[PDB]
């Protein structure tokens, strides 16, 4: 339990120095990084913790879903459109949006129906997340357990803490990756796999400096 103890590796490595007074551990992914001083209030700290974990889970899902179709298309899978920031336009295409390019799957043709279904279902599930519903009741805002851990991988509290650290670390990495995806898609104009393939060959000029001159005023 190196992370949870009063001596943890911190975000500077061995040469860390000052650690915030309130950050005594007791939380997954505690690296003593509060340079902005935003979570000084305890309730604000709890709200920011909730935001962090929800964002981490959403970003892990987003990174997986932004990488998988592109990797499949590169590997040889047929798609109507595979670029992560272009996949939304398939609903406005004549062929329609078909899962894995198969007309026998989903075969969605209207955007309004998708929007209405998403609004209704996500409203229901977020209301459940805030007030408890069919899958259980609110015990901890972030870690409900029970029906959402059916296999019981977090029965042991020590293993529970270790899994918390693992999940938060993977999630923060995924969040950083999603920010990278957004900025690279708006700068280069090609998918993450295209950028990686460009960096694979001739990395000297396949970087941000190549496009550093595209936003000069004039």
């Amino acid at each position: 339990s190196i992370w949870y103890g009063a001596d943890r590796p911190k975000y500077l490595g061995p040469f860390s120095g000052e650690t915030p007074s309130y950050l005594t551990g007791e939380f997954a992914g505690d690296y003593g990084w509060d340079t902005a001083g935003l979570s000084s209030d305890p309730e604000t700290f709890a709200r920011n913790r909730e935001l962090e974990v929800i964002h981490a889970r959403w970003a892990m899902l987003g990174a997986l879903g932004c990488l998988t179709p592109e990797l499949l298309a590169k590997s040889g899978v047929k798609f109507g459109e595979a670029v992560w920031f272009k996949a939304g336009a398939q609903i406005f295409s004549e062929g329609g949006l078909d899962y894995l390019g198969n007309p026998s799957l989903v075969h969605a043709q209207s955007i309004l129906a998708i929007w209405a279904s998403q609004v209704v279902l996500m409203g229901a599930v977020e209301g459940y997340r805030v007030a408890g519903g069919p899958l259980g009741e609110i015990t901890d805002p972030i870690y409900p357990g029970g029906s959402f851990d059916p296999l019981g991988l977090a029965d042991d509290p020590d293993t529970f803490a270790e899994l918390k650290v693992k999940e938060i670390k993977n999630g923060r990495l995924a969040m950083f990756s999603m920010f990278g995806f957004f900025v690279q898609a708006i700068v280069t104009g090609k998918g993450p796999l295209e950028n990686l393939n460009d960096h694979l060959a001739d990395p000297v000029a396949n970087n941000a400096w190549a496009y550093a001159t595209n936003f000069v005023p004039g």
Partner: protein
């Protein structure tokens, strides 16, 4: 010492000790089973000893062809001698598989005797053979054995001289291992021998960085 701070796991007593172990693999919590106090230094020094010969022989044919006292048919690239047949091949009196089997059998004999001596100090000193038990005496530690044939020169009279020599050996091993790693990196990037890379930085100091390809 050693840039990053030490954790007293090693105090400098071991031959060739510097303390640059930021992770600390011999940490008893992180050490066990395969990890043995005797085994890791032995493995390090053997990888270094073979790196000596590897670094020397990766350039010896090319430098000998350069100076002009070896047959020019031996100027083959080090990777074309038969280590990786797909890249190329070099002429020989027998097939590479035959010499491979020969060398594997002989190295099997030698390595087996060495491993027996490491496991049991009386190997080839009290075993059964045609009079080589008395010619392969096990002296001192297994990693630095010596013997009637090993100590023919008799160098290393004083313990201070021994420690000086051994720290020199480990430093040379580390530099040779880094050199050989650079050898593979240059071979996989430029596709040419390291000696030609020397010819290039000597000829064109600003020839290239990495590969630019």
């Amino acid at each position: 010492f050693a840039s990053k701070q030490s954790l007293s796991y090693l105090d400098g007593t071991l031959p060739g000790d510097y303390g640059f172990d930021p992770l600390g693999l011999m940490d008893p919590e992180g050490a066990g089973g395969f990890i043995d106090p005797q085994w890791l230094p032995y493995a390090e020094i053997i990888n270094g000893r073979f790196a000596m010969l590897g670094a020397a022989g990766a350039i010896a044919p090319e430098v000998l062809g350069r100076i002009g006292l070896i047959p020019q048919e031996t100027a083959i690239p080090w990777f074309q001698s038969g280590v990786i047949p797909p890249v190329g091949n070099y002429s020989y009196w027998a097939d590479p598989y035959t010499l491979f089997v020969l060398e594997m059998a002989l190295m099997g004999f030698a390595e087996h005797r060495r491993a027996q001596d490491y496991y049991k100090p009386g190997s080839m000193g009290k075993q059964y053979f045609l009079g080589l038990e008395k010619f392969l005496g096990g002296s001192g530690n297994p990693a630095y054995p010596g013997g009637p044939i090993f100590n023919f020169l008799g160098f290393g009279k004083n313990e201070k001289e021994l420690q000086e020599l051994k720290v020199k050996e480990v430093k040379n091993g580390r530099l040779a291992m880094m050199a050989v790693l650079g050898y593979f990196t240059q071979a996989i990037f430029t596709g040419v021998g390291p000696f030609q890379n020397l010819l290039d930085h000597l000829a064109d100091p600003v020839h290239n960085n990495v590969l630019t390809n």
